[PDB]
Chain A
Amino acid sequence: VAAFLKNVWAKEPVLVASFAIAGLAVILPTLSPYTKYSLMINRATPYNYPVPLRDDGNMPDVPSHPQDPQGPSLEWLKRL
């Protein structure tokens, strides 16, 4: 079968270039750790408005001042 990938590429190298780009396209999102950053960037882009909550017992975290060390880690993008 190892000649079939070289004795049709002497006759029609047209669709062979298509399968070579059809392949190596489905394969790569299962490979590089650059993906799931593509979902991590896409999650912390605020469209709507952040409504606040109310104190009742808890008090889990995040007081009235926003610039306190209160919220989660989305500040790795400015270092990126």
Chain B
Amino acid sequence: TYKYVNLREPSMDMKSVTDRAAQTLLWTELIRGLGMTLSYLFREPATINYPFEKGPLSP
């Protein structure tokens, strides 16, 4: 069948333009976007310590 992606017009009224003009000018994206998704460094790293530890295999 179908699915349409990126087929939508903007709202283009008085309210939601300030919602978009807060984005371009004062960066409500790009900090909430990727100043938080990256850090998120607080997970445990997964490194096989190779001369001693070795990885899984199969028979």
Contacts and interface: CB of A to CB of B under 8 A. Distances in A.
Per DSSP, chain A at the interface is: loop
A52 interface: no
Interface residues on B, range: under 10
Interface stretch (B16-24, B35-43, B45-53): B16-24
How many A residues touch the partner, as a band? under 10
Contacts of B25: 13-14, 17
A19 to B, nearest CB: 14
Interface of B: 10, 12, 14, 17, 20-21, 24-25
Interface of A: 6, 9-10, 13-14, 17
13 contacts: A6-B14, A6-B17, A9-B17, A9-B21, A10-B10, A10-B12, A10-B17, A10-B20, A10-B21, A13-B24, A13-B25, A14-B24, A17-B25
